Amino acid sequence: NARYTNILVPVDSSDAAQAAFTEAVNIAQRHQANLTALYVVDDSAYHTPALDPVLSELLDAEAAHAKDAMRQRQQFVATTSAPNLKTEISYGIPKHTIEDYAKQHPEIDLIVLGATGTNSPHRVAVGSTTSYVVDHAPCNVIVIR
Amino acid sequence: NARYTNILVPVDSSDAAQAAFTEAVNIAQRHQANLTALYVVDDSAYHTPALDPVLSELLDAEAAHAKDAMRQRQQFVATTSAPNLKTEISYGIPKHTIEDYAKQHPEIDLIVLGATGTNSPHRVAVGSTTSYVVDHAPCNVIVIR
Amino acid sequence: NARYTNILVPVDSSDAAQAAFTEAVNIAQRHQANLTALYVVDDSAYHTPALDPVLSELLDAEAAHAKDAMRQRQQFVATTSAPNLKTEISYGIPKHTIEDYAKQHPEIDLIVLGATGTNSPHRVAVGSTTSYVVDHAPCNVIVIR
Amino acid sequence: ARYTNILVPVDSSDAAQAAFTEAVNIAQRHQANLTALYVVDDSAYHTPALDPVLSELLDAEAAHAKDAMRQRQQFVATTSAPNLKTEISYGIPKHTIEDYAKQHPEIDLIVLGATGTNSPHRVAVGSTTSYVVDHAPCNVIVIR
Numbered sequence: 251n252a253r254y255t256n257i258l259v260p261v262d263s264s265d266a267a268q269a270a271f272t273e274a275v276n277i278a279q280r281h282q283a284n285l286t287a288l289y290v291v292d293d294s295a296y297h298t299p300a301l302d303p304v305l306s307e308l309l310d311a312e313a314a315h316a317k318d319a320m321r322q323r324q325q326f327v328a329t330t331s332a333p334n335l336k337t338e339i340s341y342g343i344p345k346h347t348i349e350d351y352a353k354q355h356p357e358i359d360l361i362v363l364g365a366t367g368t369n370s371p372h373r374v375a376v377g378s379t380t381s382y383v384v385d386h387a388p389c390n391v392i393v394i395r
Numbered sequence: 396n397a398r399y400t401n402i403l404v405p406v407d408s409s410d411a412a413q414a415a416f417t418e419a420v421n422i423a424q425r426h427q428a429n430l431t432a433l434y435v436v437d438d439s440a441y442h443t444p445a446l447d448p449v450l451s452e453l454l455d456a457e458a459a460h461a462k463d464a465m466r467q468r469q470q471f472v473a474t475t476s477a478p479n480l481k482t483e484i485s486y487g488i489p490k491h492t493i494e495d496y497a498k499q500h501p502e503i504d505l506i507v508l509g510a511t512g513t514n515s516p517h518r519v520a521v522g523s524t525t526s527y528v529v530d531h532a533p534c535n536v537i538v539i540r
Numbered sequence: 541n542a543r544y545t546n547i548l549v550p551v552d553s554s555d556a557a558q559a560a561f562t563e564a565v566n567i568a569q570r571h572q573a574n575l576t577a578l579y580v581v582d583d584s585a586y587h588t589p590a591l592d593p594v595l596s597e598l599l600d601a602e603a604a605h606a607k608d609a610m611r612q613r614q615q616f617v618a619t620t621s622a623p624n625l626k627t628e629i630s631y632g633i634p635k636h637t638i639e640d641y642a643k644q645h646p647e648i649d650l651i652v653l654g655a656t657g658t659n660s661p662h663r664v665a666v667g668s669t670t671s672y673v674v675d676h677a678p679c680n681v682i683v684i685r
Numbered sequence: 686a687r688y689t690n691i692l693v694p695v696d697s698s699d700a701a702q703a704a705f706t707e708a709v710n711i712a713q714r715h716q717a718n719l720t721a722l723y724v725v726d727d728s729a730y731h732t733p734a735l736d737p738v739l740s741e742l743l744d745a746e747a748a749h750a751k752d753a754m755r756q757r758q759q760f761v762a763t764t765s766a767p768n769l770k771t772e773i774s775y776g777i778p779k780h781t782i783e784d785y786a787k788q789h790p791e792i793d794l795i796v797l798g799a800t801g802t803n804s805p806h807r808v809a810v811g812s813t814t815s816y817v818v819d820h821a822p823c824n825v826i827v828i829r
């Protein structure tokens with residue numbers, strides 16, 4: 251019977267992304283699929299070179315919070331029958347970085363995304379990351395709400 | 396342990412939609428969910444009352460063809476372990492009708508869609524019916540490519 | 541001191557598109573630009589070859605109605621200081637045809653569009669033809685509402 | 686009929702500056718008021734302990750946006766455009782631009798670049814433009 255083999259679940263810090271992760275674990279268990287959770291630290295903030303260290307302080311703190319969240323997720327997955335969890339934090343423009351991750355790891359056959367994220371839940375029904383990735387992903391994409 | 400209960404798969408006459416239907420059957424099998432396939436006959440063409448019978452002839456043929464496709468899908472589904480298939484042909488503006496179907500049958504907890512359809516596979520990676528439904532659906536949506 | 545030289549105003553049969561045309565003539569007058577109004581007859585309806593005559597009867601009537609609206613538009617432009625009006629009725633998928641038209645005539649340096657059209661004013665603030673054209677046009681695009 | 690009040694939201698990109706330049710061209714022809722708006726995006730993830738770090742960053746970005754505004758004020762003085770209001774706000778850009786137009790309902794044109802700082806090698810129209818075209822109460826023109 252036909253199955254997903256390699257799932258990607260991009261997550262920001264939002265409850266909607268965490269609900270997408272939870273469903274991605276459920277999908278991974280059902281299909282006995284590999285699972286990768288990816289947080290992108292957005293590094294595109296305008297700055298002159300003089301402000302490099304202030305930007306690093308901000309992003310490295312964001313990265314550390316994201317790593318603490320991934321550690322809790324690894325513990326959670328160990329209580330399920332999903333076979334594994336790889337966790338990854340990378341820096342870049344989130345939507346581009348998600349697209350490139352999928353395209354440059356072509357074994358990935360599903361992306362699981364929250365409908366919304368940290369910025370726009372009381373303004374749109376679907377955020378611009380989700381919309382972009384739906385558009386540009388080389389594989390199936392499921393939007394969780 | 397959450398599972399889908401009632402899956403809606405909107406189909407046009409395209410191969411992309413038929414691939415979406417095949418996956419919806421796989422999801423319905425794995426979840427033992429109810430499945431409904433829905434073809435919308437687009438009835439919005441410009442016409443004066445004098446041309447009603449001409450348009451009616453064209454739309455009635457399209458409907459009949461869609462019903463032929465549906466009969467074949469019922470036969471397919473009987474070769475699988477999916478519980479059932481409800482088949483529906485509706486007249487309306489496709490993206491609005493899909494949205495309304497999901498909102499008006501709120502037990503629907505997944506919509507399955509092809510990325511593209513009959514019109515633009517050669518111009519876009521995601522068609523405007525998909526993009527509309529991803530935005531406006533009250534439930535999870537999965538885009539199949 | 542740049543000016544437009546060759547403006548395209550795609551119209552459907554909606555009031556919103558006619559308000560677009562009205563503004564296109566205003567822009568045309570100001571820049572002393574050439575103006576082209578383009579109505580696309582959507583010929584993408586599902587039909588087998590036995591049905592071509594039924595479809596053609598529908599499309600020819602739509603085309604004839606469009607031609608009468610163009611006649612009225614030529615009359616209106618002659619009451620203004622806008623240099624001219626070319627009118628065109630084409631057959632194809634509307635958003636594709638508009639894109640192709642602007643690429644076929646690269647002199648075109650503005651496309652003027654209504655925000656919405658005949659199908660979706662009660663569902664969206666901007667229609668799918670307009671968003672497609674904003675995305676895909678090789679030149680500036682103004683949206684009229 | 687003519688435009689009375691034009692808003693031209695700008696980021697720091699060349700695209701946006703081309704948008705600004707056309708906005709001046711439109712403003713002169715119509716003898717419309719012109720406002721240029723730069724929104725400092727303040728949505729970065731951060732805990733309270735990091736408030737002052739983010740403040741430092743955003744305040745520098747704001748300051749650069751002001752140097753751009755000053756150079757634009759000087760350009761507009763060379764033209765017969767009636768005026769330039771310059772403004773710098775803090776918030777989510779696309780939301781802020783929408784709010785600005787609905788909170789100043791005299792605005793009858795928004796002029797935008799097709800793309801901006803982040804995505805010209807990925808999309809033909811950016812997400813800020815997309816959102817404003819959709820949510821604006823008035824005409825919107827996309828410059829490319």
Ligand SMILES: Nc1ncnc2c1ncn2[C@@H]1O[C@H](COP(=O)(O)OP(=O)(O)OP(=O)(O)O)[C@@H](O)[C@H]1O
Pocket residue numbers: 259260261262264266267268270288289290291292344362363364365366367368369370371376377378379380381
């Ligand atoms: N930085 C990121 N890293 C990884 N995944 C992300 C990131 N940002 C968003 N996502 C994924 O995309 C989903 C939707 O977030 P998105 O950014 O589209 O919404 P939003 O922030 O509410 O709106 P917008 O950013 O368009 O204002 C999230 O639930 C998450 O799954």
Ligand SMILES: Nc1ncnc2c1ncn2[C@@H]1O[C@H](COP(=O)(O)OP(=O)(O)OP(=O)(O)O)[C@@H](O)[C@H]1O
Pocket residue numbers: 404405406407409411412413415433434435436437489507508509510511512513514515516521522523524525526
């Ligand atoms: N008339 C319809 N009835 C039911 N579902 C449809 C209909 N039209 C499209 N869909 C669904 O949406 C999916 C994508 O089709 P969509 O219409 O968005 O693409 P397209 O025809 O290529 O592009 P567009 O119509 O934007 O030019 C289809 O695979 C199908 O699942």
Ligand SMILES: Nc1ncnc2c1ncn2[C@@H]1O[C@H](COP(=O)(O)OP(=O)(O)OP(=O)(O)O)[C@@H](O)[C@H]1O
Pocket residue numbers: 549550551552554556557558560578579580581582634652653654655656657658659660661666667668669670671
């Ligand atoms: N067939 C056409 N020929 C020329 N221009 C068109 C055509 N259809 C739409 N347009 C142009 O696009 C503008 C917006 O129409 P659009 O089709 O996007 O909106 P809609 O019909 O309300 O929504 P949708 O088709 O997405 O449901 C119109 O005001 C017109 O300028």
Ligand SMILES: Nc1ncnc2c1ncn2[C@@H]1O[C@H](COP(=O)(O)OP(=O)(O)OP(=O)(O)O)[C@@H](O)[C@H]1O
Pocket residue numbers: 693694695696698700701702704722723724725726778796797798799800801802803804805810811812813814815
């Ligand atoms: N922070 C801002 N303040 C004011 N105007 C802006 C801002 N950001 C973008 N704009 C306006 O929107 C136009 C398009 O920028 P947009 O942000 O949509 O493109 P992008 O940065 O290339 O893509 P994206 O942000 O979707 O990755 C700009 O040229 C500018 O006119």
Ligand SMILES: [Ca+2]
Pocket residue numbers: 367368369377379
């Ligand atoms: Ca976001």
Ligand SMILES: [Ca+2]
Pocket residue numbers: 407512513514515522524
């Ligand atoms: Ca379609």
Ligand SMILES: [Ca+2]
Pocket residue numbers: 657658659660667669
């Ligand atoms: Ca339309």
Ligand SMILES: [Ca+2]
Pocket residue numbers: 696801802803804811813
């Ligand atoms: Ca941007």
